[PDB]
Design a protein around this ligand. Structure first.
Ligand SMILES: Nc1nc2c(ncn2[C@@H]2O[C@H](CO)[C@@H](O)[C@H]2OP(=O)(O)O)c(=O)[nH]1
Ligand SMILES: [Mg+2]
Length: 104
């Protein structure tokens, strides 16, 4: 079973932790990758009720299982904070425009 289901993409907690670890490291070093410059601040326009505090940052999580290194980010993202705590996993899949919905 999937710990996180983003549309049809299936992720386990380990997949999320791996992506998060990569995103946090780049965040700590002040480096970004990709045309959308990830990781970057997640403003939470959606108003999700995360259990951990902000600031929040988003980083792509890939269905391929590989860590994002540039190129197309896909529709899924892991959201983490300054304390490297996982806030949640969200996706553009099933959401209008560039909005987000949480992965189930
Ligand atoms: N939907 C959404 N987009 C956000 C949020 N925070 C930052 N963004 C960025 O705001 C712009 C309009 O949605 C995009 O550049 C988007 O980046 P991403 O496309 O990388 O998510 C957020 O809380 N919600
Ligand atoms: Mg996997």
């Amino acid at each position: 079973a999937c710990d996180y289901t983003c549309g049809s993409n299936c992720y386990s907690s380990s997949d999320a932790s791996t992506a998060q670890a990569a995103g946090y490291k780049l965040h700590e070093d002040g480096e970004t990758v990709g045309s959308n410059s990830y990781p970057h601040k997640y403003n939470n326009y959606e108003g999700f009720d995360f259990s951990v505090s902000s600031p929040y940052y988003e980083w792509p999580i890939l269905s391929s299982g590989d860590v994002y290194s540039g190129g197309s980010p896909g529709a899924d993202r892991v959201v983490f904070n300054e304390n490297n705590q996982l806030a949640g996993v969200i996706t553009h899949t099933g959401a209008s425009g560039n909005n987000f919905v949480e992965c189930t």
